[PDB]
Amino acid sequence: MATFTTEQAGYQMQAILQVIGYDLLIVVTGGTNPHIGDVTTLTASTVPETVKFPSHDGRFHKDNFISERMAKRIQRYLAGSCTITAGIHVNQITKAQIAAAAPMTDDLSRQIISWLQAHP
Amino acid sequence: MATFTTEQAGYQMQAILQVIGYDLLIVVTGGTNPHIGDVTTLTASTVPETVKFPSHDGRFHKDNFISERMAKRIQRYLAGSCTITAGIHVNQITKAQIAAAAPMTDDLSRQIISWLQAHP
Fold first, then answer.
1. How far apart are CA A89 and CA A86, in angstroms?
2. Judged by CB atoms within 8 Å, which residues 12-71 of A form the interface with B?
3. Other C-beta atoms within 10 Å of B103: how many?
4. Whole domain around residue A48: which residue ranges?
5. What this chain does, per the record (chains A, B)?
């Protein structure tokens, strides 16, 4: 249904939003290698819950800070269920990139909130 | 990336598949009202796990039998993580529709397996 991008100092993240009835599905990725490392689910009135996927070396992917952050930002605007995937390869990128991805996620979230307000 | 439909005695289900890098995202819906009631996650080597969304009257949605069934059918063909949503309003449809949706899910799953084998 809709694609958004955000950029901070050369690093780019993207969010693809799909409206499935009253329910939402959002894929958040970054850099040049799309991936799903974590999934966070929520409704307007329940606390978001995360499932982590295993990485190749056995560690769980820690990209859930992205999906949980977006979940917290958009929660009050949800008409139904919401499923958010995240994957920016936090196990491979620099600490500065990981830190920058938090305000970048806030920017994608506001872009999404605006789009939802314009397409209720 | 790809859409599939299946039909049994007038009832239709649909699966939208998205390839996100090596990872998969599949939305399974049915009838005339798309929805996400449940989410099942898996990899080729881990048992699928489900999160259920609450319905309006407080009962968890029970459409996860759909996503878990598809997960079991396609698991051995996965290159990475896989996230499957399901929602056919099992809390509103007839018992016969609920029962028919299980072989319909197997048909969508094979359609997906074929598409994956043709687009590795």
1. 9
2. 18, 20-25, 27, 29, 33-37, 39, 41, 43, 46, 49, 51, 53-54
3. 12
4. 13-105
5. Probably involved in tannin degradation, however the precise biochemical function in metabolism of gallate is unknown.
